[PDB]
Ligand binder design. Structure first.
Ligand SMILES: [Mg+2]
Ligand SMILES: [Zn+2]
Ligand SMILES: [Zn+2]
Ligand SMILES: [Zn+2]
Lengths: 266, 98, 168, 46, 770, 140, 115, 69, 86, 244
């Protein structure tokens, strides 16, 4: 337990801010990279269009649908279509949603993400439901229709990682900073008259003491005490984002070790 | 002290293509000419009835955006209604040599 | 102007001299005026130099003009390229232009001369005069689709039986 | 489309330099919008 | 012209190009689709039967694969529609047309292709995407960038053409161009800036980054160099890390203005045994410049070693700059308040001087400069004053710029920009000129309908007082646009005219070739020159060297070269050689030294007669200085103990080496005289450098080192001779035409036209009378 | 191995120049009136001020016992003993010139990875400096 | 179109192994390990942890081309110490450190109220 | 044509705030910057995403449908 | 045969030219690729060009270069006796 | 291309985890080389970037009309009021390692335009394909699987290189190559060759045992036939008649 330390400054449903102390720069950077590009998530992958009389194109609507965030709390219970034994897809590795919208009113009618209806067997899981994160209760404004226009389609959502396509990315911006006082001299501050007066002070400067103003440069110091803030799109809880990022990195290292042992046997 | 007329605004000496350049007076003139030539090859929304027109070739940007830095002349060129381009976050750096 | 003349001590030093620059060229008449140095008078027009001093002097003046043009922009080119160009221009005893009225009027094969300009006229003249083309040129060999005698083609590769018998 | 609808052309024996931007062009044709090829200076835009 | 001299060809590809800093100098990235389309017919042999069979089984839809199989009968089989009968059995002598794989030589070209370096041979590298990929250092010879440019690729179809392409047109062989006997490729853009930033004295690299940088060098031996600073923290210098990429045994010395071995400004360059002693690496060292690192490496170690140097330097510098960073913004073009005040005052003073001259001219008290009209002289004075004002303001702005300024960093490294760019962006755009004159009165007695008639102020005749950062007022904008339009029209017209001129020159000099008798002849056999270049050497092997005998005072000549054994005025110190005690008072050696000095004096007289201007730096084949330095650093000359050389040995070695310097090998009087005249000058350089006093006193050469130097000089001279069969006519035509494309009296393209076409009447004939 | 040269210098002045981490210091020997030193020092790790006294040593090797790219450099190990332990600033470089200033004055030029040093002194005091690599040790 | 399928970045192909270890003849007791379908995320972490071992003399990694998702790791240890064992030790250290960090983050998160 | 679903730079969901942004501008008489801040868009990458969007789907909806049903 | 210069009075350069080397290597590579007998031991090779380069290095190429002169005469130079220094 | 003459192609594409990032987590959507700024003197690009940053932060439209009172100092003051460096520089971190870049990067929004030129609409290669009826050479036009032109300039460059065999292969094997029979009496290529019956005849010369075959470009054959139509007789002979 006497390893990396964590101190949470602000916790919310969309942003988690913490200080990661007693850790290496490589480890912190790898953590953020994994949290950005290697957390599995559920998103719409294939779309079959039955009727489309809209002013928008089928590929346009398919891209917009694929960018909708879907719940992925129980994603680990879902299987990869590539690793599943089925013809095209099944309930064990995919979720099927349906969209049916008609212009029954004279005024413009908006097709949101809340209109997507799950027609697959979730088997008691907690995946598939589009994320609603607004006061009105609607979701993403998928499209607009006028009177007489219909949109009928079926979406098949599969699990993946953001490395394959950014639509599976469960994490938004990640604030990442260290050494706000530039005590390690990792940056040469560009300036015209006075660098201190021309460069604003970072908000994290309050958590570290200022330089002694006359002390010799510390050449034995190493980067540590990172300030991080993870923002989540809503597919999974932010704390779950961090936990699963650590889990993914650990699994990757364990896979390296397992491959090394496999080669050792031969 | 013998003026007989006054310019409405000097910015009106420019043409349609040259009225899209932001701060053209801070640029070298050949760059302004190059931009005037190239702006006619940028993708946008040439017309709103492209779904009923049958042209040989047509290009339509998915998500057009109006420039953050605009020019007063463009208001009469309807650049904010049918923009051709996007506001990309640009960094000027030597990252990998690519 | 500034010219470097050897000093009595032995070092090269720069001294000022008065040089007259004139618009218009009358070389033969100006050269005979007393007081000037006839051994250093120069003319921008190499044609007058050729007519007054000879073909070799015209060659030197032409090279000087070409070098001046090339070096005016600050670029530097090896001597031999310009020397070859000027030598080709002056190899027939006169100033042969680089146009269709100069080198293209020589006797270097109809198939070679027609590739530049006046193709049909050159071919008709060759037919009327019953010209014989030896196909020594790169243009002729290119037209006929055969290995030109240039670079790797300037020699014939033959097999050595004397070495074949001894290579075992 | 707007530039094409507001383009002009000048047919090039003459003794002059129509490709330059004359002073009298001020406020009548764009001083910067012109093709970079063989039509540079001959095709003007109002 | 449309179907015989040039024609459409097969086995070619075209697409957009891109820059790949991770590709070797001679490597070219080829899209997978283009690789699958282009094919090479490989003959079936016992050494490749299995590989060709595997490719045939793979078929035409999988790279690597095959598309056609040709039997010994000449019939061709398409692997598509052929799998019905199964895989074909290959036999010796058949041909398999298989996709171009890695390391396949291919000819890479870019139009207009104005010179031979614009079409060079590359090794294929099959990569993912739809664009060709080429190293950044090879963009300059191609005159290409990545704004949308396209380049052509051609695939040879025979082993003979394949070998010819890989042995004559290979990129490494074209590093040293013959147009200006200097390298045609070099570090450029990002790497040129990064090397300059990395070689600064303040650049120190820690262990973790040093290990990665070292591993990034493919040819790194695996030995970690000792850090420059051991305590209190191990730190490696950027020079230390960069020296790893330079091959061992390379020596280079260059002195800039004010440079000293204790270089306080870190200027100049000193590399010993491949280790950078001091000096910031910039365009003068790794750029395509005469006497640079690229030239030294390619002439000492070879073209392959130079090509590897390119990649090593690019990789290490690219990694370092990727992890260091470099940018530029609006703040880099902003000068401080005091500098802006000084610039404004300077411009005001220049304007006041212009006002004074204008008032004097209007008062008629100004006398026209002789040979010009009053108005012309007034315009000349005004233009001079305004141009000097711009130059002074630019100087002030550049001086104010700090070292951290990014534009200043680029200019100092030579990657991009210049003093005029800095001045125009920060201080003042300056006077605008059309047809080499101030803005003319397009209207009646005025330039625009905003000034009064007969106005001659700088702001009225087109002086842009403001800078780009400040912004141009509308009148300045219009005048600057007029200038830019002038530039564009000049560009177009000059492009067309230069193209025509280049075609004419090539067609005029296409049939000239150097024959096996060293004569330069055309197709008719007519002799243009009795020896190519009047010396018989190849331009690619020519370097600029200084003749030490033509220059210098008589006293300096006497001190440097004369050696006396009878008198005590110019006696040779006995500690310079092992026989310096018994050498004194020897009349045979005295007469030998007298003959040597007499020959040197005659050489000085002849050199001064040939070069009237007294210039001593001329292009010559063999660089003797580098040979001497290599001998010294290879044999570790003591520099203190006397050498074993004897005056007899030195004199006779030089004399007999002059005999081994052979260009013409005829056995008759005519050819012998031609041979002597061909090397008279190089013999002068050889005698000036390998003098008895110079060898014994300055170089301290040993007997073994002297013999090695003589042998190396002979080998280098024999290698510098022109190869028979070279198309010197086409080479010269291209070398003269290529500068023309980038191109009181007529000059430039118009004058080149007036020269090539023998014009009876020229625009500005003139005479110079002394 | 063994000290090739040792002395005490009084830093006459220090010039930072255009650099922010490297400063050029001019010093003269405290015991010899004909010995002077010009040296480039990384002041970020070893600050030097005017009127400072520096003990300067030049050695052929850092190992204590005499042992007269050599070998791959490796990070120091625990318990390793070397001459560096007795000093504060240590640099490693090569000599690239020996110059005769006067009848008996000789100057040796050293380069520590771009940081230049010039040691001018008597021929009988700089006779042990060879055309090779050496360690420079500075102690305050 | 010649854009490779995106799953090639992480999915291992047929006949391709995650690790390819070869001795290095440039120096004694040196090995080069090619990691397939891996990138800087693992390269930097493993190299940084290797550099912390006292019995490791050289540890570096590089990505020859960003187009291909594979990187090379050169490891040289002291005499008598196996580079394979050094890599094993680094990986085990990473696993333990990550586990400790995960436990600390979970216990800290459980103490919050807003989420 | 229609509001993008995700911010290009970072991937934040912004397609569910177009109607709220318009409502804030119209009914609340709030400035564009204040509305963007109230919507939770802190990074200028998302601020430009919502600020510079042009709604062409409204114009496209003015044409009569090609096919009825 | 008045056009064949006797070996005792050959005046051409005794060093192989770049073009001669390129053509010799290409011709020998073509012959090897067409299953020609190789007179040099191979330590493991599959490229005909590499095999030809080995043959040239060891002077085992049974080819003679017929250098032509502008007057029509020629000189025969064996690859073995031609110096390869470039 | 941007609105300042700065046009370029995408050298390579990087993911968010590999792109450099600031402390705020903003990654660039596009990176351009600094070296394009100095020589081209497009200060308007930098001013537009700064103005766009301020406009995005404040929720306004930047006034970039040419001749107004807007100044870089004013834009910088407005930007500094928002908590950013007045000149737009930001501290960035390397995506691969997370270490701060020593230099600070000019970072901000900019209006970019997608041009009509796409690589997928220009890429084309040909190993073999249709030949034109007239010259029997590769057809022109990439849409018809046509070939590329090996023009006079390319021929001259190859001549300078000395690759005679490569030049011949390009002009013959990679293009039209035709075998014709010529009579030894008359160079005219009017020899009727019944190859199946192994017979040759040159009517007019009354010979059948004096025929030679030559390989020439079909363009050369067409040229000779056109000259024959124009009454010129290009006679090809395989032996020399005059000494050098
Ligand atoms: Mg271009
Ligand atoms: Zn399944
Ligand atoms: Zn965003
Ligand atoms: Zn006949």
């Amino acid at each position: 337990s006497e390893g990396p330390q964590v101190k949470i400054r602000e916790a919310s449903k969309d942003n988690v801010d913490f200080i990661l102390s007693n850790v290496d720069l490589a480890m912190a950077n790898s953590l953020r990279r994994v949290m950005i590009a290697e957390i599995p998530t559920l998103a719409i992958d294939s779309v079959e269009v039955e009727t489309n009389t809209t002013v928008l194109a089928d590929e346009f609507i398919a891209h917009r649908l694929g960018l909708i965030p879907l719940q992925s709390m129980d994603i680990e219970q879902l299987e990869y279509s590539r690793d599943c034994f089925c013809e095209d897809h099944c309930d064990k590795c995919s979720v099927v949603l349906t969209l049916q919208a008609f212009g029954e009113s004279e005024s413009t009618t908006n097709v949101y993400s809340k209109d997507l209806v799950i027609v697959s067997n979730l088997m008691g899981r907690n995946i598939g439901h589009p994320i609603i994160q607004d006061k009105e209760g609607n979701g993403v404004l998928i499209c607009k229709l006028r009177k007489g226009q219909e949109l009928k389609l079926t979406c098949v959502a599969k699990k993946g990682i953001a490395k394959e396509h950014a639509k599976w990315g469960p994490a938004a911006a990640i604030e990442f900073e260290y050494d706000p006082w530039n005590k390690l001299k990792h940056t040469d501050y560009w300036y015209e008259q006075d660098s201190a007066k021309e460069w604003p002070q970072s908000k994290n400067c309050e958590y570290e003491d200022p330089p002694n103003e006359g002390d010799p440069f510390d050449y034995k110091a190493q980067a540590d005490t990172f300030y991080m803030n993870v923002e989540s799109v809503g597919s999974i809880p932010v704390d779950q984002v961090v936990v699963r990022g650590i889990d993914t990195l650990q699994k990757k290292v364990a896979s390296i070790l397992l491959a090394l042992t496999q080669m050792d046997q031969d | 002290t013998t003026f007989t007329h006054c310019e409405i605004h000097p910015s009106m000496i420019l043409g349609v293509a040259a009225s899209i350049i932001p701060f053209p007076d801070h640029n070298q003139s050949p760059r302004n000419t190059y931009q005037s030539a190239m702006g006619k090859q940028a993708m946008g929304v040439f017309l709103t009835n492209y779904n009923v027109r049958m042209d040989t070739m047509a290009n339509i940007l998915y998500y057009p955006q109006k420039p953050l830095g605009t020019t007063r002349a463009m208001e009469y060129l309807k650049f904010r209604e049918l923009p051709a381009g996007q506001n990309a976050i640009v960094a000027i750096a030597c990252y990998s040599g690519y | 102007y500034d010219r470097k003349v050897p000093s009595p001590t032995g070092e090269y030093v720069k001294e000022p001299e008065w040089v007259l620059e004139t618009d218009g060229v009358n070389l033969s008449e100006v050269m005979t005026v007393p007081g000037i140095d006839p051994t250093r008078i120069y003319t921008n027009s190499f044609i007058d130099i050729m007519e007054v001093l000879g073909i070799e002097a015209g060659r030197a003046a032409l090279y000087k003009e070409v070098y001046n043009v090339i070096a005016s922009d600050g670029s530097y080119v090896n001597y031999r390229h310009m020397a070859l160009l000027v030598d080709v221009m002056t190899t027939q005893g006169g100033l042969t232009s680089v146009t269709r009225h100069g080198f293209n009027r020589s006797n270097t094969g109809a198939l070679m001369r027609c590739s530049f300009e006046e193709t049909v006229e050159i071919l008709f003249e060759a037919g009327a005069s019953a010209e014989l083309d030896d196909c020594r040129g790169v243009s002729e060999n290119v037209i006929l689709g055969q290995m030109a005698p240039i670079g790797t083609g300037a020699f014939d590769v033959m097999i050595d039986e004397e070495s074949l018998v001894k290579y075992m | 489309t707007l530039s094409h609808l507001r383009r002009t052309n000048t047919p090039i024996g003459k003794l002059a330099k129509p490709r330059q931007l004359h002073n009298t062009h001020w406020g009548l044709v764009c001083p910067a919008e012109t093709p970079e090829g063989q039509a540079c200076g001959l095709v003007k835009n109002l | 012209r449309g179907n015989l001299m040039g024609k459409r060809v097969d086995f070619s590809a075209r697409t957009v190009i891109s820059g790949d800093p991770n590709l070797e100098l001679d490597q070219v990235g080829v899209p997978k689709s283009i690789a699958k389309t282009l094919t090479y017919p490989e003959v079936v042999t016992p050494y490749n039967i299995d590989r060709l069979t595997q490719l045939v089984r793979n078929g035409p839809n999988e790279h690597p694969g095959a598309k056609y199989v040709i039997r010994d009968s000449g019939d061709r089989i398409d692997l598509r529609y052929s799998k019905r009968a199964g895989d074909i059995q290959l036999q010796y002598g058949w041909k398999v047309e298989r996709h171009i794989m890695d390391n396949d030589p291919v000819l890479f070209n870019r139009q207009p292709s104005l010179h031979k370096m614009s079409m060079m041979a590359h090794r294929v590298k099959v990569i993912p995407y739809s664009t060709f990929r080429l190293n950044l250092s090879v963009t300059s010879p191609y005159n290409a960038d990545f704004d949308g440019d396209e380049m052509n690729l051609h695939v040879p179809q025979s082993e003979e053409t394949r070998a010819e392409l890989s042995q004559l047109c290979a990129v490494p062989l074209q590093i040293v161009s013959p147009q200006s006997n200097k390298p045609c490729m070099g570090i450029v853009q990002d790497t040129l800036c990064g090397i300059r930033k990395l070689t600064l004295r303040d650049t120190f690299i820690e262990l973790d980054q040093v290990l990665n940088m070292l591993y990034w060098v493919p040819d790194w031996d695996g030995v970690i160099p000792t850090p420059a600073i051991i305590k209190p923290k191990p730190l490696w210098s950027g020079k230390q890390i960069l020296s790893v990429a330079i091959p061992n045994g390379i020596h280079l010395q260059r002195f800039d203005e004010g440079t000293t071995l204790l270089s306080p400004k870190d200027n100049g360059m000193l590399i010993i045994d491949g280790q950078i002693i001091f000096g910031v690496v910039e365009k003068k060292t790794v750029g395509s410049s005469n006497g640079g690192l690229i030239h030294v490496v390619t002439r000492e170690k070879g073209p392959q070693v130079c090509a590897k140097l390119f990649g090593n330097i690019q990789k290490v510098v690219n990694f370092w700059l990727l992890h260091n960073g470099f940018s530029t913004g609006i703040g880099d073009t902003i000068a401080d308040g005091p500098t802006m005040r000084e610039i404004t005052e300077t411009i005001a003073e220049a304007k006041k001087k212009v006002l004074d001259v204008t008032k004097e001219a209007q008062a008629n008290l100004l006398t026209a400069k002789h040979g010009m009209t009053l108005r012309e002289s007034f315009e000349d004075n005004v233009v001079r004053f305004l141009n000097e004002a711009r130059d002074k303001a630019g100087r002030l702005a550049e001086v104010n710029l700090k070292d951290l300024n990014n534009v200043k960093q680029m200019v100092m490294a030579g990657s991009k920009g210049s003093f005029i760019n800095i001045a125009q962006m920060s201080a003042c755009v300056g006077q605008q000129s059309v047809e080499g004159k101030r803005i003319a009165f397009g209207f009646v007695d005025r330039t625009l309908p905003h000034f009064s008639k007969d106005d001659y102020s700088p702001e009225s005749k087109g002086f842009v007082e403001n800078s780009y950062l400040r912004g141009l007022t509308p009148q300045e904008f219009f005048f600057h646009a007029m200038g830019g339009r002038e530039g564009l029209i000049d560009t177009a017209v000059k492009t067309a005219e230069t193209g025509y001129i280049q075609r004419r020159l090539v067609k005029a000099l296409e049939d000239i070739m150097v024959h096996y008798d060293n004569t330069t002849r055309n197709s008719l056999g007519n002799v243009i020159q009795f020896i190519y270049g009047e010396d018989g050497m190849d331009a690619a092997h020519i370097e600029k060297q200084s003749l030490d005998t033509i220059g210098g005072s008589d006293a300096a000549f006497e001190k440097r070269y004369r050696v006396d054994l009878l008198n005590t005025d110019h006696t040779l110190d006995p500690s310079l050689l092992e026989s310096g005690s018994e050498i004194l008072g020897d009349l045979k050696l005295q007469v030998l030294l007298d003959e040597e000095y007499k020959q040197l004096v005659k050489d000085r007289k002849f050199l001064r007669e040939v070069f009237v201007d007294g210039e001593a730096n001329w292009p010559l084949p063999v660089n003797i200085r580098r040979i001497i330095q290599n001998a010294q650093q290879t044999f570790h000359i003591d520099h203190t103990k006397p050498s074993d050389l004897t005056i007899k040995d030195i004199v006779l070695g030089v004399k007999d080496l002059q005999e081994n310097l052979l260009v013409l090998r005829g056995k008759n009087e005519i050819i012998q005289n031609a041979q002597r005249d061909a090397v008279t000058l190089f013999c002068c350089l050889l005698r000036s450098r390998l003098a008895t006093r110079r060898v014994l006193q300055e170089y301290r050469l040993t007997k073994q080192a002297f013999d090695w130097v003589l042998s190396n000089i002979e080998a280098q001279f024999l290698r510098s001779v022109v190869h028979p069969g070279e198309m010197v006519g086409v080479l010269a035509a291209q070398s003269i035409g290529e500068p023309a494309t980038q191109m009181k009296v007529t000059s430039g393209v118009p004058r080149l036209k007036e020269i090539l076409n023998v014009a009876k009447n020229m625009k500005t004939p003139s005479l110079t009378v002394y | 191995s063994n000290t090739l040269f040792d002395d005490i210098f009084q830093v006459s002045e220090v010039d930072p120049g255009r650099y922010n981490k490297v400063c050029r210091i001019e010093a003269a020997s405290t015991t010899q009136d004909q010995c002077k030193l010009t040296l480039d020092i990384n002041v970020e790790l070893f600050p030097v001020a005017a009127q400072d006294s520096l003990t300067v040593t030049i050695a052929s090797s850092l190992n204590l016992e005499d042992t007269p790219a050599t070998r791959s450099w490796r990070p120091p190990q625990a318990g390793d003993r070397s001459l560096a332990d007795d000093y504060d600033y240590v640099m490693y470089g090569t000599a690239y010139k020996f110059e005769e200033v006067s009848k008996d004055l000789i100057a040796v030029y050293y380069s520590f990875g771009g940081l230049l040093m010039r040691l001018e002194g008597n021929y009988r005091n700089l006779n042990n400096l060879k055309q090779e690599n050496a360690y420079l040790l500075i102690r305050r | 179109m010649n854009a490779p399928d995106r799953f090639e970045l992480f999915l291992l192909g047929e006949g391709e192994s995650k690790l390819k270890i070869d001795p290095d003849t440039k120096a004694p007791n040196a090995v080069v390990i090619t990691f397939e379908k891996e990138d800087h995320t693992l390269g930097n972490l493993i190299r940084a942890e290797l550099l912390n071992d006292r019995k490791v003399l050289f540890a570096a990694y590089k990505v020859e081309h960003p187009f291909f998702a594979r990187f090379k790791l050169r490891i040289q240890t002291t005499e008598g110490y196996d580079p394979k064992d050094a890599l094993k030790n680094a990986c085990n250290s990473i696993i333990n450190k990550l586990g400790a960090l995960k436990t600390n983050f979970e216990t800290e998160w459980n103490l919050q109220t807003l989420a | 044509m229609i509001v993008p679903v995700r911010c290009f730079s970072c991937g934040k969901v912004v397609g569910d705030k177009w109607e709220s942004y318009l409502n804030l501008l119209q009914e609340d008489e709030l400035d564009e910057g204040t509305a963007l801040s109230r919507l939770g868009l802190k990074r200028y990458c998302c601020r430009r995403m919502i600020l510079t969007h042009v709604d062409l789907i409204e114009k496209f909806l003015r044409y009569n449908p090609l096919e009825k049903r | 045969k008045e056009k064949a210069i006797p070996k005792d009075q050959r005046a051409t350069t005794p060093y192989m030219t770049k073009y001669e080397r390129a053509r010799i290597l290409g011709t020998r590579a073509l012959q090897i690729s067409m299953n020609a007998p190789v007179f040099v031991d191979l330590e493991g090779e599959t490229d005909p060009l590499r095999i030809a380069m080995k043959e040239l290095a060891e002077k085992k190429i049974p080819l003679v270069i017929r250098r032509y002169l502008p007057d029509g005469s020629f000189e025969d130079w064996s690859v073995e006796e031609l110096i390869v220094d470039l | 291309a941007s609105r300042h003459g700065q046009k370029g192609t995408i050298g390579i594409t990087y993911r968010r985890e590999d792109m450099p990032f600031t402390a705020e987590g903003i990654v660039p959507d596009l990176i351009i080389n600094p070296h394009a700024i100095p020589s081209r003197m497009t200060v308007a690009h930098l001013i537009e970037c700064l103005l766009s940053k301020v406009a995005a932060l404040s929720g306004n439209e930047g006034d970039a009309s040419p001749f107004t009172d807007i100044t870089v100092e004013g834009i910088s003051k407005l930007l500094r009021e928002h908590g950013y460096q007045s000149r737009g520089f930001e501290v960035m971190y390397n995506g691969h390692t997370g270490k701060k870049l020593m230099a600070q990067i000019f970072f901000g929004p900019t209006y970019y335009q997608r041009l009509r030129h796409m690589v997928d609409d220009k890429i084309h290669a040909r190993a073999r394909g249709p030949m034109q009826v007239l010259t029997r050479q590769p057809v022109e036009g990439r849409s018809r699987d046509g070939g590329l032109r090996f023009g006079e300039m390319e021929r001259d460059c190859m001549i300078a290189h000395g690759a005679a065999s490569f030049l011949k292969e390009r002009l013959m094997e990679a293009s039209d190559a035709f075998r014709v029979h010529i009579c030894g009496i008359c160079g005219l290529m009017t020899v009727i060759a019944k190859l199946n019956h192994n017979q040759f005849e040159c009517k007019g010369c009354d010979n059948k045992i004096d025929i030679y075959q030559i390989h020439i470009p079909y363009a050369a054959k067409l040229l000779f036939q056109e000259l024959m139509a124009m009454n010129i007789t290009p006679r090809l002979y395989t032996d020399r008649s005059r000494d050098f």
